[PDB]
Amino acid sequence: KWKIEPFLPGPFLEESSFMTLFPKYRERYLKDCWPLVTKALEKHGIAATLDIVEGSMTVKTTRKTYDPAAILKARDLIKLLARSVPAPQALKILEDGMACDIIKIRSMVRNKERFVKRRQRLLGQNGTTLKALELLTQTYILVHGNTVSVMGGYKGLKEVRRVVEDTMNNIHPIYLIKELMIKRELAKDPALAHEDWSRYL
Amino acid sequence: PKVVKKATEIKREELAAIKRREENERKHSNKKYEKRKSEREKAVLVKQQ
Amino acid sequence: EDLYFLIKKAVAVRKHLERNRKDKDSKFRLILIESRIHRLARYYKTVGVLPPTWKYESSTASTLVA
Amino acid sequence: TTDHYLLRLFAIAFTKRRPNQIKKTTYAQSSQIRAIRRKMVEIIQREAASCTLHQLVSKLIPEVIGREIEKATQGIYPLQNVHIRKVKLLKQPKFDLGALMALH
Amino acid sequence: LVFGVARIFASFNDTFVHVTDLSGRETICRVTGGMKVKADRDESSPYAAMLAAQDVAARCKELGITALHIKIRATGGNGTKTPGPGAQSALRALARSGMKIGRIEDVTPTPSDST
Amino acid sequence: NDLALQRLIAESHILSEAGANPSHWQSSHAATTGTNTRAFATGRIAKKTTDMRIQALGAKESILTQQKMPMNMRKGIVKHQEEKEKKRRQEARENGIVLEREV
Amino acid sequence: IGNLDLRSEKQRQAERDLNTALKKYLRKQRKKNIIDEKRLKAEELYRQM
RNA sequence: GAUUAAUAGGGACAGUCGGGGGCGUCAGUAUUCAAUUGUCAGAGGUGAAAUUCUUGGAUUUAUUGAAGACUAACAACUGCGAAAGCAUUCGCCAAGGAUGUUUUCAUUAAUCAGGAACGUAAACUAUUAGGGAUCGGACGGCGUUUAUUUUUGACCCGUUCGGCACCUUACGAUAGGAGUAUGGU
């Protein structure tokens, strides 16, 4: 009911193409880590070029593409690659059941020092709270200045969005991870299938 | 000893910095059409009798 | 004179503050200018260059502009 | 324009990164930014209040306006690219089927 | 060939395959995922969008337009601004069961400053 | 007050570095690295986690770490680890990613 | 033991002192597919020929 | 009759600079509400549900109008203000900082009793002696680009003030708890 089958086999009249721009340090990393991305995108059937003059990634559908979702996967892939995620993580968003999201978190806090405190609180001591959030939601979270990048499945995306909202609204991430652990236990045992779970939080 | 090694690393950093300053001044100034004065020449400011 | 330029500046910021009446940074700067004016005027009273009864709160301002 | 069409033009311009530079940030001071926007408003108004709507869109297709903006603003600060990102016709006051079939 | 434009409104909760003419006003056919799957939990499934796209493509080829411009969107006001598994699997099922695809555009409403 | 939460927070590093996060690239590459698809991966992870719990309970030294090295291997290991952590902090400062504060 | 490390010596001296092949070069660089301003100049030269 | 003119002060002028403030004005979307049209069975949540809205047509699609809010991306190991705080365009109003001067008065200074103006939270924590960045002036000048050629601005680099921060150096410094018993209450 939830499983996505791999596309087995010209579905594009107008040769579609997407573009994104990036700065110079990203140009250095993208140039010495590009051939992985272009091998995987050629396997899916999408021609991808990088321009170190202008600083622009371009993806475009070739003649031999058949998977039509591949161009949108390519668009989100190159958006994240400009947004400085690691390249193996980008090739993992090239999977079928994967999806990204960005959370703008600068608007939700007014005071500068309070926002810095809450962002470091979301990241946690030694990265422990972050990696434990990644564990309990099966996602990958990257606190990126004013925005928070996240990749994973859709249920986990909703959970991570909720947790980021509550941590910015000053509900502590330790409280949130305790909530998530208890919810995980109630997901394990099946005799508690459909009741109001609020009696345990 | 530690003080001498520390201060000589700082001395190398300062001398390399001054050399890069003089190098950029040569490359971007009108002094480009001259020969680099040797340092054994640069040691004596003036001689008089 | 230094005191003349300072009281002219105080007159200017006071006229603007009377027209607007909402900001507070203008009030803070007017306070600082009034303090500087009072210290300098005190020094000038001590050196004796002006009459010791010369005072400015607002009527000296209105008379010097009128 | 000449045909009593009131319209709004929203133009967007990105700052040029000059070749042979080492400084990573190509920031312009706020005085330069306001002067560049003033020149942009001047150029757009001067090349949009002289012509008709058909001439305006015959200008909009090959992007002459961004080219002239770049050509006239590169002296105050070079611009990487100048596009006209929106063109909204607000009010049309006439129904001239003569001019309409003249287009068609 | 006649291009019809399909709005795929793919939330996290439900999926909307919507087919209109180039105006966007004249609705040809719409099929959601909730009207094809019984479970509200499974309402947003790639299976739901697969069945929805099969129904929609069957309808629009029985009309005979066989070519679609695709506009995908998501909940954009205070939501996530990213489409759904409905969107991906629906596009896949569509161009598998026919439907020469023209221009793809991800037209989501992005607020300048919301709250 | 809670304990199992403290265990999860502490041992997340080992668990996510071993095998349990199929969306993180390190965790998937380590789910097929060879030393976690070997025969007793969960047992070796159990050994590491039991040492971590005793270290939280109050032991000052470890059981997994080695003690005697010929100073060249140890200086090489320590220099490489410090260079890698500094390189990650620098490649975070560039691109603006924030990391955890630690002296 | 004692001969010149020729590559090291040429690099040291560099540090002190400071129409058939371009076709296969462009073929090699068209599989990257980095735009590469040197490849740009080379493509302009190949346009000129 | 009246000193140096201070590497302590204030003032003037000029070119500037700023997401400093106040007043009006201009837009941008989005949200909500409403209208019109195409609609045709769910839409909406949630881990799962439900409440609710739904043939008088919800959600959706397209076009408008009104209201109220905020100003995404740009957005920084930046900028501004005394703090709190400050990011749409433009106009006005005053103020303010830095720099330069072939500009003045010459202790006017520093500090704070008293006093005066501004106003749901927390939750892992006389130099250092240089260097590389950075922004604001100012001076310079091998050259690219505006430049149809002088302006002028952009890029490079050098000199000199000033300041927000980095690292290195210190020049130094200094500031009962848990178990286990016994007997009472």
Phi-psi region of F8 (alpha: psi -120 to 50; beta: other; left: phi over 0): alpha
Residue of chain A with shortest Cα separation from G38: A53
Q: How far apart are CA F46 and CA C63, in angstroms?
A: 91
Work out if D4's Cβ lies within 7 angstroms of strand H.
Answer: no
Q: Where are the beta strands (DSSP E) in chain D?
A: 6-15, 79-91
Q: Match 């405190």 to its residue by tokens.
A: A117
Spell out which residues of C between 11 and 50 contact strand H, using CB within 7 Å: 12-13, 16, 19-20, 22-29, 31, 33, 36, 39-40, 43, 46
Asked if residue A136 lies in contact with residue F5, where contact means CB atoms within 8 angstroms, the answer is no
- Long-range CB pairs of D57-64 (<8 Å, 24+ gap) are D60/D84, D60/D87
Q: Residue A71 is nearest to which of E84, E94, E104, comparing CB atoms? A: E104
Asked if residue E106 lies in contact with residue A17, where contact means CB atoms within 8 angstroms, the answer is no
Cα Rg of chain C (Å, integer): 13
Tell me which residue of A37, A44, A154 sits closest to A100, measured CA to CA.
Answer: A154
Q: How far apart are CA G15 and CA G8, in angstroms?
A: 11
Cβ contacts below 8 Å, chain A against chain F, sum to 86
Estimate to the nearest angstrom the gap between the alpha carbon of A184 and the chain centroid: 22
Q: Match 């299976």 to its residue by tokens.
A: E47
Tokens of E4: 């019809």
Q: How far is A67 from chain E (nearest CA, A)?
A: 7
Spell out which residues of A between 134 and 173 contact strand H, using CB within 7 Å: 145-146, 155, 158, 162, 170-172
Tell me which residue of A29, A47, A30 sits closest to A38, measured CA to CA.
Answer: A47
CB atoms within 10 A of CB F13: 17
Asked if residue E56 lies in contact with residue E20, where contact means CB atoms within 8 angstroms, the answer is no
CA distances to C7, C34, C36, E91, E101 from C15, rounded to whole Å, are: 12, 14, 19, 68, 69
Q: Is A148 an 8 Å CB contact of chain E?
A: no
Contact residues for A197 (Cβ-Cβ < 8 A; gap 6+): A183, A186
Strand-by-strand arrangement of the A147-152 sheet: A99-104, A147-152, A140-144
Contact residues for D29 (Cβ-Cβ < 8 A; gap 6+): none
CB atoms within 10 A of CB C34: 17
Q: Residue A53 is nearest to which of G32, G33, G40, comparing CB atoms? A: G40
| CA-to-C1' span, F50 to H140 (A) | 70
CB atoms within 10 A of CB A42: 14
Q: How far apart are CA F14 and CA A126, in angstroms?
A: 13
Work out if E3's Cβ lies within 7 angstroms of strand H.
Answer: no
Contact residues for B36 (Cβ-Cβ < 8 A; gap 6+): B26
Residue of chain A with shortest Cα separation from E3: A13
Contact residues for A152 (Cβ-Cβ < 8 A; gap 6+): A98, A99, A137, A138, A139, A140, A160, F23
Tell me which residue of A93, A29, A76, A37 sits closest to A55, measured CA to CA.
Answer: A29
CA distances to C57, F42, G25 from C49, rounded to whole Å, are: 19, 94, 89
How does DSSP classify residue D83? E
Q: Which amino acid is at D32?
A: Q
Protein residue closest to H144, using CA and C1': D20
Contact yes or no for A51 and G33 at CB 8 A: no
Spell out which residues of E between 29 and 68 contact strand H, using CB within 7 Å: 29-30, 32-35, 39-41, 43-44
Asked if residue E86 lies in contact with residue E10, where contact means CB atoms within 8 angstroms, the answer is yes
DSSP state letters, A7-19? P----BSS--EEE
Contact yes or no for A48 and G33 at CB 8 A: yes
Work out if D22's Cβ lies within 7 angstroms of strand H.
Answer: yes
Q: How far apart are CA A155 and CA E12, in angstroms?
A: 8
Q: How far apart are CA A143 and CA A147, in angstroms?
A: 7
**Cα angle at E64 between E59 and E68, to 5 degrees?**
80
Cα Rg of chain A (Å, integer): 20
Q: Where are the beta strands (DSSP E) in B9-49?
A: none
Contact residues for A62 (Cβ-Cβ < 8 A; gap 6+): A45, A46, A47
Chain G partners of A54 at a C-beta cutoff of 8 Å?
35
Tokens of A66: 């058949």
How does DSSP classify residue A96? S
DSSP state letters, chain E? -EEEEEEEEE-SS-EEEEEE-TTS-SEEEEEESTTT-S-STTSS-HHHHHHHHHHHHHHHHHHT-EEEEEEEE--TTTT-----HHHHHHHHHHHHSS-EEEEEEE-----SS--
Q: Match 């080492």 to its residue by tokens.
A: D22
Q: Which amino acid is at F83?
A: E
CA distances to D25, E4, E67, E104, G20 from A14, rounded to whole Å, are: 37, 15, 12, 9, 36
Contact yes or no for F20 and A178 at CB 8 A: no
Q: Match 């003649």 to its residue by tokens.
A: A63
Tokens of A79: 């958006």
Asked if residue F16 lies in contact with residue F29, where contact means CB atoms within 8 angstroms, the answer is no
Asked if residue E37 lies in contact with residue E45, where contact means CB atoms within 8 angstroms, the answer is yes
Q: How many helices (H) and strands (E) does chain A have?
A: 8, 6
Chain A partners of E80 at a C-beta cutoff of 8 Å?
101, 157, 161
Which other chains touch chain C, taking contact as 3+ CB pairs less than 8 Å apart?
none
Query: Would you mind telling me the total number of residues written for chain F in this entry?
Result: 103
| 3-state SS, residue A155 | helix
Please tell me what resolution, in angstroms, this structure has.
4.0
Q: Which amino acid is at F48?
A: K
Contact residues for D70 (Cβ-Cβ < 8 A; gap 6+): D78, D79, D81, D82
- G33 phi/psi in degrees, rounded to 5: -120, 50
Asked if residue D86 lies in contact with residue D12, where contact means CB atoms within 8 angstroms, the answer is no
Contact residues for A19 (Cβ-Cβ < 8 A; gap 6+): A56, A57, A58, A59
Q: How far is E101 from chain A (nearest CA, A)?
A: 5
Q: How far apart are CA D47 and CA D68, in angstroms?
A: 9
Residues 58-97 of E with CB under 8 A from A: 67, 72, 80-85, 87-89, 91-92, 94-96
Identify any residues that bridge with D53 across adjacent strands, giving them in sequence order. Answer: none
Asked if residue A24 lies in contact with residue A55, where contact means CB atoms within 8 angstroms, the answer is yes
Q: How far is A81 from chain G (nearest CA, A)?
A: 15
Q: How far apart are CA A27 and CA A43, in angstroms?
A: 23
Contact residues for E90 (Cβ-Cβ < 8 A; gap 6+): E8, E10, E15, E17, E49, E50, E52, E53
Identify any residues that bridge with E33 across adjacent strands, giving them in sequence order. Answer: none
Tell me which residue of G34, E84, B33, D68 sits closest to A31, measured CA to CA.
Answer: G34
